[PDB]
User: Which sequence fits this backbone?
């Protein structure tokens, strides 16, 4: 599991002012790796397929309601022509 | 002579023009529900 390395370790005694070829040490945190929990991708409760099914069912319900509105609102011209024509004839009777 | 003859003009002007009042109302109010039907059909398009 350990990444491979030709050099095990050596003894280095750094100074402050004369760090020549200023490197970038790999910093490490101080909290134990036991507190650093492993990652888990929390899967969503629903799937996009179930989303499609539910949204399509809702679209079917909305379309049924819109069709009901259409059949109730398509007769209004029929009401117009059923109500005024007898009255227009009555006015013509004068 | 022109008493009754002109008196009939009042009833003529009232009734014969109330006649086409209903005609213009028919011509105008029928052109309103078509827009409502078009709007609801576009709503059905958007779903």
Assistant:
């Amino acid at each position: 599991m350990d990444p491979y390395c030709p050099f095990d370790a050596l003894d280095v005694w750094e100074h402050r002012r004369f760090i020549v070829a200023d490197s970038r040490n790999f910093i490490t945190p101080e909290f134990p790796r036991d507190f650093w929990m492993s990652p888990v991708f929390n899967l969503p409760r629903e799937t996009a397929a179930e989303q499609v099914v539910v949204l399509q069912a809702q679209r079917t319900a909305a379309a049924a309601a819109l069709e009901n509105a259409a059949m109730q609102a398509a007769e209004l011209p029929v009401d117009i022509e059923r109500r005024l024509r007898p009255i227009e004839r009555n006015v013509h009777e004068i | 002579q022109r008493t009754g003859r002109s008196a009939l003009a009042v009833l003529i002007r009232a009734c014969y023009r109330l006649q086409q009042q209903l005609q213009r109302t028919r011509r105008a109010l029928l052109h309103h529900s078509d827009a409502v039907l078009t709007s609801l059909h576009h709503v059905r398009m958007l779903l």
